[PDB]
Amino acid sequence: LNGGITDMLTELANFEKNVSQAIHKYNAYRKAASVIAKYPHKIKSGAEAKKLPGVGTKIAEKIDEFLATGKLRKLEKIRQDDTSSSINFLTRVSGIGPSAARKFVDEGIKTLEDLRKNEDKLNHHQRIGLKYFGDFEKRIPREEMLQMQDIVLNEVKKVDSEYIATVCGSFRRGAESSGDMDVLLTHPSFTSESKLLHQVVEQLQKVHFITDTLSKGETKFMGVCQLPSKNDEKEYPHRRIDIRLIPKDQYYCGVLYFTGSDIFNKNMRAHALEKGFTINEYTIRPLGVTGVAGEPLPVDSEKDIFDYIQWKYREPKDR
DNA sequence: GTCGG
DNA sequence: GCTGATGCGCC
DNA sequence: CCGACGGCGCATCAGC
Ligand SMILES: *CC[C@H](OP(*)(=O)O)[C@H](O)COP(=O)(O)O
């Protein structure tokens, strides 16, 4: 219902981010596209859509146009602009943002063919993003994710028994498909006050699960992983993996945050805000009488964060 | 672009 | 060689 | 009428 509208808005969002480099317009168009996608009727007028929050004068007036003519004049102009369309396409490559995209097209590099021809002009990330272009646009069915999980959990257990690995994102909420694999990592040895990630990455490279490294440091890893070929069947497609080392006293605040979604956290952060607590990626802290966030509270589980704000626990399933 | 002080 | 700015991706 | 809208880890480059 109203799919033609939500497409038009997503198409404009991508344009403002990649071509215009107007990030706040991109977020506004997304917000408008998301609300209209949730709406349980067929929008027949821009004035109707305007009642929904995140829809204003301008979007209402291009909804009036789309419903009347069956297309948008501004987008028809952009789709037949060589610069705009090319810049949009290049940014689909991981490591190519709006800056790199613009510079490439300015020196006559527009297509994957042109990127392969000129691999000497790309950094490490962009080369890998090019290598696994199609494999990264593929979704991951929940079946594959469970096999990927067991390997990680097992391999981490082999390195040290005291490691606590939790796979979050769409997967933990019980979604039938996920985009990437976001793993959280902690260890009794590592707190806020008092080579943990290295040896785990080193181990998962040794059993040929992790194939490539996009970035790595003390606390955070981003790379590429692959399930082992059954041999009888065709080899599995390469997936994006993110391993994140978090202090022990900030794990469940980390888990809660990275379990999602964008709306749930915003709603929980908003509810918590007025009840007299400020929660973020790291901690839950009480606000003083003067609206001053003091010392962080202790957290033993996700449940404790719900206990503090007297909000009834919502299992990852229902978020 | 839309919102809210 | 160092330190700070900037690009990129990201609940 | 006009500023806020995401703050951060890592890779890379500009400036010295
Ligand atoms: C489409 C309307 C746009 O609204 P904004 O707050 O960037 C602009 O007015 C540009 O319109 P266009 O020239 O028709 O794209």
mmCIF file of all heavy atoms in Angstrom, chain A residues 84-126:
data_model
loop_
_atom_site.group_PDB
_atom_site.id
_atom_site.type_symbol
_atom_site.label_atom_id
_atom_site.label_comp_id
_atom_site.label_asym_id
_atom_site.label_seq_id
_atom_site.Cartn_x
_atom_site.Cartn_y
_atom_site.Cartn_z
ATOM 1 N N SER A 84 24.775 12.313 -11.705
ATOM 2 C CA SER A 84 23.948 11.941 -10.523
ATOM 3 C C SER A 84 23.804 10.418 -10.416
ATOM 4 O O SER A 84 24.098 9.875 -9.334
ATOM 5 C CB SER A 84 22.598 12.607 -10.569
ATOM 6 O OG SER A 84 22.715 14.002 -10.337
ATOM 7 N N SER A 85 23.355 9.765 -11.493
ATOM 8 C CA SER A 85 23.071 8.306 -11.555
ATOM 9 C C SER A 85 24.346 7.503 -11.267
ATOM 10 O O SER A 85 24.267 6.537 -10.479
ATOM 11 C CB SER A 85 22.470 7.924 -12.884
ATOM 12 O OG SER A 85 23.353 8.240 -13.951
ATOM 13 N N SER A 86 25.468 7.889 -11.885
ATOM 14 C CA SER A 86 26.804 7.254 -11.717
ATOM 15 C C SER A 86 27.260 7.366 -10.258
ATOM 16 O O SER A 86 27.667 6.333 -9.689
ATOM 17 C CB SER A 86 27.820 7.855 -12.654
ATOM 18 O OG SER A 86 27.596 7.414 -13.984
ATOM 19 N N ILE A 87 27.195 8.573 -9.684
ATOM 20 C CA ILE A 87 27.593 8.864 -8.273
ATOM 21 C C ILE A 87 26.750 7.990 -7.335
ATOM 22 O O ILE A 87 27.331 7.412 -6.401
ATOM 23 C CB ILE A 87 27.460 10.367 -7.948
ATOM 24 C CG1 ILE A 87 28.494 11.202 -8.708
ATOM 25 C CG2 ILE A 87 27.549 10.610 -6.445
ATOM 26 C CD1 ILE A 87 28.189 12.682 -8.747
ATOM 27 N N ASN A 88 25.437 7.908 -7.581
ATOM 28 C CA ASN A 88 24.489 7.045 -6.823
ATOM 29 C C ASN A 88 24.978 5.593 -6.844
ATOM 30 O O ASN A 88 24.984 4.959 -5.771
ATOM 31 C CB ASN A 88 23.058 7.119 -7.370
ATOM 32 C CG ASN A 88 22.094 7.805 -6.427
ATOM 33 O OD1 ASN A 88 22.413 8.841 -5.846
ATOM 34 N ND2 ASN A 88 20.912 7.235 -6.265
ATOM 35 N N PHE A 89 25.364 5.090 -8.019
ATOM 36 C CA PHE A 89 25.747 3.671 -8.234
ATOM 37 C C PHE A 89 27.037 3.348 -7.473
ATOM 38 O O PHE A 89 27.039 2.368 -6.708
ATOM 39 C CB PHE A 89 25.910 3.350 -9.721
ATOM 40 C CG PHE A 89 26.398 1.946 -9.968
ATOM 41 C CD1 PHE A 89 25.648 0.859 -9.546
ATOM 42 C CD2 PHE A 89 27.617 1.709 -10.585
ATOM 43 C CE1 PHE A 89 26.099 -0.436 -9.749
ATOM 44 C CE2 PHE A 89 28.064 0.413 -10.791
ATOM 45 C CZ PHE A 89 27.304 -0.657 -10.374
ATOM 46 N N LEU A 90 28.096 4.137 -7.686
ATOM 47 C CA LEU A 90 29.444 3.919 -7.089
ATOM 48 C C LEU A 90 29.332 3.749 -5.567
ATOM 49 O O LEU A 90 30.046 2.885 -5.028
ATOM 50 C CB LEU A 90 30.363 5.098 -7.432
ATOM 51 C CG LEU A 90 30.875 5.172 -8.871
ATOM 52 C CD1 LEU A 90 32.097 6.073 -8.951
ATOM 53 C CD2 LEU A 90 31.212 3.794 -9.423
ATOM 54 N N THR A 91 28.469 4.533 -4.911
ATOM 55 C CA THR A 91 28.317 4.588 -3.429
ATOM 56 C C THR A 91 27.747 3.266 -2.891
ATOM 57 O O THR A 91 27.810 3.071 -1.659
ATOM 58 C CB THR A 91 27.457 5.783 -3.002
ATOM 59 O OG1 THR A 91 26.231 5.735 -3.731
ATOM 60 C CG2 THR A 91 28.142 7.111 -3.234
ATOM 61 N N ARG A 92 27.213 2.402 -3.764
ATOM 62 C CA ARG A 92 26.759 1.027 -3.410
ATOM 63 C C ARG A 92 27.964 0.166 -3.006
ATOM 64 O O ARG A 92 27.763 -0.791 -2.233
ATOM 65 C CB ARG A 92 25.998 0.384 -4.574
ATOM 66 C CG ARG A 92 24.632 1.004 -4.833
ATOM 67 C CD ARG A 92 24.004 0.554 -6.140
ATOM 68 N NE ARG A 92 23.793 -0.887 -6.226
ATOM 69 C CZ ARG A 92 23.219 -1.511 -7.254
ATOM 70 N NH1 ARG A 92 22.788 -0.826 -8.300
ATOM 71 N NH2 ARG A 92 23.076 -2.825 -7.233
ATOM 72 N N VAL A 93 29.160 0.486 -3.514
ATOM 73 C CA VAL A 93 30.449 -0.160 -3.120
ATOM 74 C C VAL A 93 30.792 0.266 -1.688
ATOM 75 O O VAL A 93 30.808 1.483 -1.422
ATOM 76 C CB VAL A 93 31.592 0.201 -4.091
ATOM 77 C CG1 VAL A 93 32.959 -0.167 -3.531
ATOM 78 C CG2 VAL A 93 31.392 -0.427 -5.461
ATOM 79 N N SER A 94 31.072 -0.704 -0.811
ATOM 80 C CA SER A 94 31.541 -0.478 0.581
ATOM 81 C C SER A 94 32.925 0.177 0.535
ATOM 82 O O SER A 94 33.807 -0.366 -0.155
ATOM 83 C CB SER A 94 31.565 -1.764 1.367
ATOM 84 O OG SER A 94 31.712 -1.502 2.754
ATOM 85 N N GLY A 95 33.091 1.313 1.221
ATOM 86 C CA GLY A 95 34.337 2.105 1.232
ATOM 87 C C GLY A 95 34.251 3.329 0.332
ATOM 88 O O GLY A 95 35.049 4.263 0.545
ATOM 89 N N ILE A 96 33.341 3.316 -0.652
ATOM 90 C CA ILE A 96 33.024 4.476 -1.540
ATOM 91 C C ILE A 96 31.834 5.234 -0.940
ATOM 92 O O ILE A 96 30.712 4.689 -0.966
ATOM 93 C CB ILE A 96 32.743 4.015 -2.988
ATOM 94 C CG1 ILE A 96 33.982 3.372 -3.619
ATOM 95 C CG2 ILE A 96 32.209 5.170 -3.829
ATOM 96 C CD1 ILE A 96 33.837 3.014 -5.084
ATOM 97 N N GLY A 97 32.080 6.437 -0.413
ATOM 98 C CA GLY A 97 31.040 7.364 0.072
ATOM 99 C C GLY A 97 30.787 8.479 -0.938
ATOM 100 O O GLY A 97 31.297 8.429 -2.056
ATOM 101 N N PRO A 98 30.002 9.518 -0.576
ATOM 102 C CA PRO A 98 29.658 10.594 -1.509
ATOM 103 C C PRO A 98 30.873 11.394 -2.005
ATOM 104 O O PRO A 98 30.816 11.906 -3.109
ATOM 105 C CB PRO A 98 28.731 11.513 -0.695
ATOM 106 C CG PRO A 98 28.250 10.655 0.457
ATOM 107 C CD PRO A 98 29.398 9.713 0.749
ATOM 108 N N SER A 99 31.923 11.488 -1.180
ATOM 109 C CA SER A 99 33.178 12.229 -1.472
ATOM 110 C C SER A 99 33.965 11.497 -2.564
ATOM 111 O O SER A 99 34.218 12.111 -3.622
ATOM 112 C CB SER A 99 34.006 12.410 -0.225
ATOM 113 O OG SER A 99 35.036 13.360 -0.437
ATOM 114 N N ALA A 100 34.323 10.233 -2.313
ATOM 115 C CA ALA A 100 35.088 9.357 -3.233
ATOM 116 C C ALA A 100 34.325 9.202 -4.554
ATOM 117 O O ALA A 100 34.970 9.280 -5.617
ATOM 118 C CB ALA A 100 35.341 8.018 -2.585
ATOM 119 N N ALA A 101 33.006 8.997 -4.477
ATOM 120 C CA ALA A 101 32.096 8.807 -5.632
ATOM 121 C C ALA A 101 32.207 10.001 -6.586
ATOM 122 O O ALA A 101 32.459 9.777 -7.785
ATOM 123 C CB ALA A 101 30.678 8.619 -5.150
ATOM 124 N N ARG A 102 32.031 11.219 -6.064
ATOM 125 C CA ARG A 102 32.078 12.487 -6.846
ATOM 126 C C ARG A 102 33.431 12.603 -7.557
ATOM 127 O O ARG A 102 33.428 12.885 -8.770
ATOM 128 C CB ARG A 102 31.824 13.698 -5.942
ATOM 129 C CG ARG A 102 32.204 15.035 -6.567
ATOM 130 C CD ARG A 102 31.392 16.203 -6.041
ATOM 131 N NE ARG A 102 30.118 16.325 -6.741
ATOM 132 C CZ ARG A 102 28.945 15.863 -6.312
ATOM 133 N NH1 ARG A 102 28.840 15.234 -5.150
ATOM 134 N NH2 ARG A 102 27.864 16.039 -7.053
ATOM 135 N N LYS A 103 34.532 12.395 -6.827
ATOM 136 C CA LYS A 103 35.922 12.535 -7.343
ATOM 137 C C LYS A 103 36.159 11.539 -8.487
ATOM 138 O O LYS A 103 36.800 11.937 -9.480
ATOM 139 C CB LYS A 103 36.954 12.334 -6.228
ATOM 140 C CG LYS A 103 38.398 12.289 -6.714
ATOM 141 C CD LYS A 103 39.428 12.702 -5.688
ATOM 142 C CE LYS A 103 40.752 13.072 -6.326
ATOM 143 N NZ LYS A 103 41.850 13.122 -5.331
ATOM 144 N N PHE A 104 35.677 10.299 -8.350
ATOM 145 C CA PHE A 104 35.840 9.215 -9.356
ATOM 146 C C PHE A 104 35.174 9.629 -10.672
ATOM 147 O O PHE A 104 35.819 9.513 -11.730
ATOM 148 C CB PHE A 104 35.264 7.885 -8.855
ATOM 149 C CG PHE A 104 36.120 7.140 -7.860
ATOM 150 C CD1 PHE A 104 35.546 6.526 -6.757
ATOM 151 C CD2 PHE A 104 37.490 7.021 -8.039
ATOM 152 C CE1 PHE A 104 36.327 5.833 -5.843
ATOM 153 C CE2 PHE A 104 38.269 6.330 -7.123
ATOM 154 C CZ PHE A 104 37.686 5.736 -6.028
ATOM 155 N N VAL A 105 33.928 10.104 -10.600
ATOM 156 C CA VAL A 105 33.087 10.474 -11.780
ATOM 157 C C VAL A 105 33.661 11.737 -12.440
ATOM 158 O O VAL A 105 33.504 11.873 -13.669
ATOM 159 C CB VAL A 105 31.610 10.648 -11.374
ATOM 160 C CG1 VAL A 105 30.755 11.191 -12.510
ATOM 161 C CG2 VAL A 105 31.024 9.345 -10.851
ATOM 162 N N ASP A 106 34.307 12.615 -11.665
ATOM 163 C CA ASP A 106 34.941 13.866 -12.167
ATOM 164 C C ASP A 106 36.135 13.517 -13.067
ATOM 165 O O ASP A 106 36.387 14.288 -14.013
ATOM 166 C CB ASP A 106 35.347 14.797 -11.018
ATOM 167 C CG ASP A 106 34.185 15.551 -10.390
ATOM 168 O OD1 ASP A 106 33.030 15.316 -10.809
ATOM 169 O OD2 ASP A 106 34.442 16.370 -9.486
ATOM 170 N N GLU A 107 36.829 12.405 -12.795
ATOM 171 C CA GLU A 107 37.978 11.911 -13.609
ATOM 172 C C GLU A 107 37.538 10.700 -14.447
ATOM 173 O O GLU A 107 38.401 9.862 -14.777
ATOM 174 C CB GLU A 107 39.194 11.623 -12.721
ATOM 175 C CG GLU A 107 39.010 10.488 -11.725
ATOM 176 C CD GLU A 107 40.133 10.352 -10.708
ATOM 177 O OE1 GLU A 107 41.156 11.053 -10.858
ATOM 178 O OE2 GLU A 107 39.984 9.544 -9.768
ATOM 179 N N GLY A 108 36.247 10.628 -14.790
ATOM 180 C CA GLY A 108 35.691 9.727 -15.820
ATOM 181 C C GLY A 108 35.649 8.267 -15.397
ATOM 182 O O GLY A 108 35.708 7.406 -16.295
ATOM 183 N N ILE A 109 35.538 7.988 -14.092
ATOM 184 C CA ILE A 109 35.354 6.616 -13.526
ATOM 185 C C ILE A 109 33.925 6.518 -12.976
ATOM 186 O O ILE A 109 33.639 7.190 -11.968
ATOM 187 C CB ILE A 109 36.425 6.312 -12.457
ATOM 188 C CG1 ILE A 109 37.836 6.425 -13.046
ATOM 189 C CG2 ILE A 109 36.177 4.955 -11.809
ATOM 190 C CD1 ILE A 109 38.954 5.999 -12.118
ATOM 191 N N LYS A 110 33.071 5.714 -13.624
ATOM 192 C CA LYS A 110 31.595 5.703 -13.409
ATOM 193 C C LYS A 110 31.077 4.302 -13.046
ATOM 194 O O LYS A 110 30.098 4.240 -12.280
ATOM 195 C CB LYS A 110 30.877 6.203 -14.667
ATOM 196 C CG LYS A 110 31.502 7.417 -15.341
ATOM 197 C CD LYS A 110 30.641 8.005 -16.437
ATOM 198 C CE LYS A 110 31.397 8.965 -17.329
ATOM 199 N NZ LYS A 110 30.495 9.651 -18.284
ATOM 200 N N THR A 111 31.674 3.229 -13.583
ATOM 201 C CA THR A 111 31.149 1.835 -13.505
ATOM 202 C C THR A 111 32.129 0.912 -12.769
ATOM 203 O O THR A 111 33.295 1.310 -12.584
ATOM 204 C CB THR A 111 30.866 1.279 -14.905
ATOM 205 O OG1 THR A 111 32.088 1.304 -15.644
ATOM 206 C CG2 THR A 111 29.801 2.057 -15.645
ATOM 207 N N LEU A 112 31.660 -0.285 -12.388
ATOM 208 C CA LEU A 112 32.480 -1.361 -11.762
ATOM 209 C C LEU A 112 33.640 -1.709 -12.699
ATOM 210 O O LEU A 112 34.770 -1.882 -12.207
ATOM 211 C CB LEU A 112 31.617 -2.603 -11.506
ATOM 212 C CG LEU A 112 30.481 -2.448 -10.496
ATOM 213 C CD1 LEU A 112 29.654 -3.722 -10.423
ATOM 214 C CD2 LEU A 112 31.005 -2.079 -9.116
ATOM 215 N N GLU A 113 33.350 -1.806 -14.000
ATOM 216 C CA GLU A 113 34.348 -2.055 -15.077
ATOM 217 C C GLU A 113 35.497 -1.051 -14.927
ATOM 218 O O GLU A 113 36.665 -1.484 -14.952
ATOM 219 C CB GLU A 113 33.702 -1.943 -16.461
ATOM 220 C CG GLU A 113 32.465 -2.809 -16.642
ATOM 221 C CD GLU A 113 31.141 -2.097 -16.412
ATOM 222 O OE1 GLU A 113 30.903 -1.066 -17.073
ATOM 223 O OE2 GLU A 113 30.354 -2.570 -15.567
ATOM 224 N N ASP A 114 35.167 0.234 -14.748
ATOM 225 C CA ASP A 114 36.140 1.354 -14.619
ATOM 226 C C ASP A 114 36.902 1.231 -13.292
ATOM 227 O O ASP A 114 38.082 1.632 -13.261
ATOM 228 C CB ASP A 114 35.448 2.715 -14.746
ATOM 229 C CG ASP A 114 34.689 2.904 -16.049
ATOM 230 O OD1 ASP A 114 35.159 2.386 -17.083
ATOM 231 O OD2 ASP A 114 33.627 3.558 -16.019
ATOM 232 N N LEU A 115 36.258 0.705 -12.242
ATOM 233 C CA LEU A 115 36.876 0.488 -10.903
ATOM 234 C C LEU A 115 37.887 -0.663 -10.972
ATOM 235 O O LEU A 115 38.978 -0.513 -10.388
ATOM 236 C CB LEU A 115 35.797 0.191 -9.856
ATOM 237 C CG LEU A 115 34.929 1.372 -9.428
ATOM 238 C CD1 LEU A 115 33.845 0.914 -8.467
ATOM 239 C CD2 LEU A 115 35.765 2.472 -8.793
ATOM 240 N N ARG A 116 37.533 -1.768 -11.640
ATOM 241 C CA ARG A 116 38.429 -2.941 -11.844
ATOM 242 C C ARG A 116 39.651 -2.501 -12.658
ATOM 243 O O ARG A 116 40.780 -2.868 -12.271
ATOM 244 C CB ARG A 116 37.697 -4.086 -12.551
ATOM 245 C CG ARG A 116 36.538 -4.668 -11.755
ATOM 246 C CD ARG A 116 36.280 -6.128 -12.072
ATOM 247 N NE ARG A 116 35.013 -6.586 -11.514
ATOM 248 C CZ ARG A 116 33.812 -6.346 -12.037
ATOM 249 N NH1 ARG A 116 33.688 -5.641 -13.151
ATOM 250 N NH2 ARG A 116 32.730 -6.814 -11.438
ATOM 251 N N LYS A 117 39.422 -1.736 -13.733
ATOM 252 C CA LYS A 117 40.473 -1.155 -14.612
ATOM 253 C C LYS A 117 41.443 -0.310 -13.773
ATOM 254 O O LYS A 117 42.649 -0.332 -14.083
ATOM 255 C CB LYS A 117 39.833 -0.331 -15.737
ATOM 256 C CG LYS A 117 39.204 -1.156 -16.855
ATOM 257 C CD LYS A 117 38.197 -0.410 -17.717
ATOM 258 C CE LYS A 117 38.799 0.231 -18.952
ATOM 259 N NZ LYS A 117 39.534 1.478 -18.632
ATOM 260 N N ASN A 118 40.941 0.384 -12.743
ATOM 261 C CA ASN A 118 41.715 1.351 -11.918
ATOM 262 C C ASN A 118 41.689 0.936 -10.439
ATOM 263 O O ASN A 118 41.291 1.773 -9.604
ATOM 264 C CB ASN A 118 41.180 2.775 -12.087
ATOM 265 C CG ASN A 118 41.272 3.285 -13.509
ATOM 266 O OD1 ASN A 118 42.079 4.162 -13.806
ATOM 267 N ND2 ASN A 118 40.453 2.745 -14.396
ATOM 268 N N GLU A 119 42.118 -0.291 -10.123
ATOM 269 C CA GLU A 119 42.226 -0.797 -8.723
ATOM 270 C C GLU A 119 43.384 -0.097 -8.000
ATOM 271 O O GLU A 119 43.420 -0.160 -6.755
ATOM 272 C CB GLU A 119 42.415 -2.317 -8.682
ATOM 273 C CG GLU A 119 41.109 -3.095 -8.698
ATOM 274 C CD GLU A 119 41.157 -4.469 -8.048
ATOM 275 O OE1 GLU A 119 42.237 -4.859 -7.556
ATOM 276 O OE2 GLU A 119 40.111 -5.149 -8.036
ATOM 277 N N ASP A 120 44.292 0.539 -8.749
ATOM 278 C CA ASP A 120 45.477 1.267 -8.216
ATOM 279 C C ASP A 120 45.039 2.553 -7.501
ATOM 280 O O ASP A 120 45.840 3.073 -6.704
ATOM 281 C CB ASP A 120 46.480 1.586 -9.329
ATOM 282 C CG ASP A 120 45.985 2.619 -10.330
ATOM 283 O OD1 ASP A 120 44.915 2.387 -10.928
ATOM 284 O OD2 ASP A 120 46.671 3.647 -10.497
ATOM 285 N N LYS A 121 43.827 3.048 -7.779
ATOM 286 C CA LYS A 121 43.304 4.342 -7.258
ATOM 287 C C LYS A 121 42.434 4.115 -6.013
ATOM 288 O O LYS A 121 42.022 5.123 -5.406
ATOM 289 C CB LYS A 121 42.487 5.059 -8.336
ATOM 290 C CG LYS A 121 43.174 5.193 -9.689
ATOM 291 C CD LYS A 121 42.345 5.926 -10.723
ATOM 292 C CE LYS A 121 42.255 7.418 -10.484
ATOM 293 N NZ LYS A 121 43.549 8.097 -10.729
ATOM 294 N N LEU A 122 42.155 2.855 -5.656
ATOM 295 C CA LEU A 122 41.279 2.489 -4.509
ATOM 296 C C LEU A 122 42.142 2.121 -3.297
ATOM 297 O O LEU A 122 43.229 1.545 -3.498
ATOM 298 C CB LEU A 122 40.381 1.310 -4.899
ATOM 299 C CG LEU A 122 39.666 1.411 -6.247
ATOM 300 C CD1 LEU A 122 38.654 0.285 -6.398
ATOM 301 C CD2 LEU A 122 38.980 2.758 -6.417
ATOM 302 N N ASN A 123 41.654 2.426 -2.091
ATOM 303 C CA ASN A 123 42.252 1.991 -0.799
ATOM 304 C C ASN A 123 41.860 0.529 -0.546
ATOM 305 O O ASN A 123 41.128 -0.036 -1.381
ATOM 306 C CB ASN A 123 41.851 2.920 0.355
ATOM 307 C CG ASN A 123 40.355 3.063 0.533
ATOM 308 O OD1 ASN A 123 39.608 2.093 0.418
ATOM 309 N ND2 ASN A 123 39.905 4.273 0.823
ATOM 310 N N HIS A 124 42.328 -0.049 0.565
ATOM 311 C CA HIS A 124 42.110 -1.468 0.962
ATOM 312 C C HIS A 124 40.610 -1.788 1.028
ATOM 313 O O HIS A 124 40.205 -2.802 0.426
ATOM 314 C CB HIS A 124 42.806 -1.759 2.299
ATOM 315 C CG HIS A 124 42.740 -3.193 2.705
ATOM 316 N ND1 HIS A 124 43.455 -4.177 2.048
ATOM 317 C CD2 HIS A 124 42.052 -3.813 3.687
ATOM 318 C CE1 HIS A 124 43.209 -5.344 2.609
ATOM 319 N NE2 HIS A 124 42.352 -5.147 3.619
ATOM 320 N N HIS A 125 39.831 -0.963 1.740
ATOM 321 C CA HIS A 125 38.364 -1.125 1.947
ATOM 322 C C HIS A 125 37.663 -1.203 0.587
ATOM 323 O O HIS A 125 36.943 -2.192 0.352
ATOM 324 C CB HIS A 125 37.807 0.021 2.808
ATOM 325 C CG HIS A 125 36.419 -0.196 3.319
ATOM 326 N ND1 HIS A 125 36.035 0.195 4.589
ATOM 327 C CD2 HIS A 125 35.324 -0.748 2.752
ATOM 328 C CE1 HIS A 125 34.767 -0.107 4.778
ATOM 329 N NE2 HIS A 125 34.308 -0.686 3.666
ATOM 330 N N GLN A 126 37.880 -0.198 -0.267
ATOM 331 C CA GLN A 126 37.215 -0.035 -1.590
ATOM 332 C C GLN A 126 37.510 -1.243 -2.489
ATOM 333 O O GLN A 126 36.576 -1.700 -3.179
ATOM 334 C CB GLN A 126 37.675 1.266 -2.251
ATOM 335 C CG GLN A 126 37.120 2.516 -1.582
ATOM 336 C CD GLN A 126 37.771 3.787 -2.074
ATOM 337 O OE1 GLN A 126 38.808 3.768 -2.735
ATOM 338 N NE2 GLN A 126 37.160 4.912 -1.745
#
